[PDB]
Amino acid sequence: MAPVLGYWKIRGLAQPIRLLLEYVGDSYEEHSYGRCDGEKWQNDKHNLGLELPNLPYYKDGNFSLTQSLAILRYIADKHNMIGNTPVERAKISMIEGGLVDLRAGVSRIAYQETFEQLKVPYLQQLPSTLRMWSQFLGNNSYLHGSTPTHLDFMFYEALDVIRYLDPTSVEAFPNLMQFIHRIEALPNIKAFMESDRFIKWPLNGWSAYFGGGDAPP
């Protein structure tokens, strides 16, 4: 019995954790809740023993966790990706926070029925947001240090979702386009994404007006 990752059968908040685990090659099992599996989650949520029940959850025998960033960080920490001194640990936590915000900017408007109109000031403001990430990355291959960390898988998934929302926005920054292909070329990431384990869709929860439904529109 490997460590279990529990989440909706969507990319959402779990995709970076899935990408990280496949990158480092660790053993894990997913317990995936499909669109009609709400009751089953209601049962686990009551019975699993989670101290702060939520999705996603992570459970390895008696040890359990909720909160996407806590679970990412637990795996990142087992691999020495959360930095070495108070200054570095803090820098890494900043970058995390910004990447949380970058993904959630999509999430915040994607469930709204007025998505198509919220999209317009979203795209007016996005170039300055992408510019800041594009300048922060500069000509480094990765966000922090010289090898892939959890930060890169957060950043990847946010850039891939935004590129699907509006490709021209992301194409204005050559280094963010090259980052995207660099991650998809990491051999473990490429093998994952070619496997039947990979959830390509939906981006958000099924009920979203952008990146929802069972299949791309």
Which whole-number Å values give the CA distances from 82 to 92, 98, 133, 158, 187, in the listed order? Answer: 6, 15, 20, 20, 23
Pair type for strands 57-60 and 4-8: antiparallel
**Interface pattern 15-34 for Zn ion (x via CB under 5 A):** ---------x-x--------
Q: Contacts with its own copies in 19-78 (CB under 8 A)?
A: 51-54, 63, 65-71, 73-74, 77-78
Residue 160 annotated as part of some ligand binding site: no
Contact (Cβ atoms closer than 8 angstroms) between residue 156 and residue 19: yes
Tokens of 102: 């970058």
Whose Cβ is closer to Zn ion: residue 90's or residue 104's?
90
The yes or no reply on residue 112 touching its own copies (CB under 8 A) is no
Name which of its own copies, ligand GSH, Zn ion, none residue 55 binds, using a CB cut-off of 5 to 8 Å depending on partner kind. ligand GSH
Report the alpha-carbon distance of residue 195 to residue 19 in Å, rounded.
13
By CB neighbour count within 10 A (0-12 exposed, 13-18 middle, 19+ buried), where does 213 fall?
A: middle
CB of 155 to its own copies, least distance (A): 12
Of 96 and 186, which has the nearer Cβ to ligand GSH?
96
CB of 25 to its own copies, least distance (A): 18
Strands, E, within the chain: which ranges?
Answer: 4-8, 29-33, 57-60, 63-66
Enumerate binding residues for its own copies (CB under 8 A). Answer: 51-54, 63, 65-71, 73-74, 77-78, 82, 86-87, 89-91, 93-98, 132, 136
Annotated binding site: 7-8, 26, 41, 45, 54-55, 68, 79, 101
